[PDB]
Design a protein around this ligand. Structure first.
Ligand SMILES: O=C(O)[C@]1(O)C[C@@H](O)[C@H](O)[C@H](O)C1
Ligand SMILES: O=C(O)[C@]1(O)C[C@@H](O)[C@H](O)[C@H](O)C1
Lengths: 133, 141
């Protein structure tokens, strides 16, 4: 019965990808504030942590899509993949605005980040209900 | 298969409570950034969404612990709600530090927030394994 656990094992991929992705972003925003108040060695560690969480969640998303090959999950998983990439792109945007110390640049891409994360939340619900079967 | 769907549901409540809880705090951090940049109206929407997401994640943790009753699961469940309480009030500290437009108080409670979340993440993993142990145990009849 690979049906029952490759499925439940797809939930570790999906959930940890999302948890790591939102922590990636949260660390950048925290880091930016840490840089504004002169906490620079601390902020550097939040930037490094955001980079590695982005790499580990991306790897999980790719493995999730590689394993959702039945016709039902197929399109939903690719839409997940494309929206996750959309979100990762915005968070790399947050990192670049932090390295440039630009409040305005941050405001530009933070809108993209919230919009993509709001969609990942609803996609998450559609994926756990589809996979619960 | 009655109890098995309940271990799946319990793992979903937990994973979604944490996701939304971290989203709640990220909204405060980026909303502070927007406010420093002069974007007070966007920041107001982030503040509101942060409260909404805290209310939802807090309802999911309360529901998780209500149905986490077996002894293998109760010890971790009460530590979760105690560690979640710590996170939710560090986030409330972030919101108040934003209220007072003060960088340095934000840094104090941000250390509390990351420290609570580190412990919360370990507690989540233990519950996920324990719930998946019960899951597999039921199928090993
Ligand atoms: O611990 C993390 O991963 C956070 O991502 C650290 C910090 O960026 C935030 O204040 C969040 O509350 C949690
Ligand atoms: O949508 C959210 O919940 C966020 O929490 C909104 C914004 O605060 C962030 O930049 C995150 O990347 C996503």
């Amino acid at each position: 019965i690979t049906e029952l656990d490759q499925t439940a094992h797809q939930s570790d991929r999906l959930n940890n990808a999302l948890l790591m992705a939102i922590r990636s972003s949260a660390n950048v925003s925290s880091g930016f504030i840490e840089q504004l108040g002169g906490h620079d060695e601390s902020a550097g560690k939040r930037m490094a942590l955001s980079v590695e969480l982005n790499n580990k969640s991306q790897a999980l998303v790719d493995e999730f899509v590689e394993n959702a090959r039945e016709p039902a999950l197929r399109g939903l998983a690719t839409e997940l993949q494309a929206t996750f990439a959309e979100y990762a792109k915005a968070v790399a945007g947050q990192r670049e605005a932090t390295r440039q110390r630009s409040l305005e640049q941050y405001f530009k891409v933070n809108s993209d980040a919230g919009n993509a994360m709001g969609r990942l939340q609803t996609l998450r619900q559609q994926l756990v209900t589809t996979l619960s079967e």
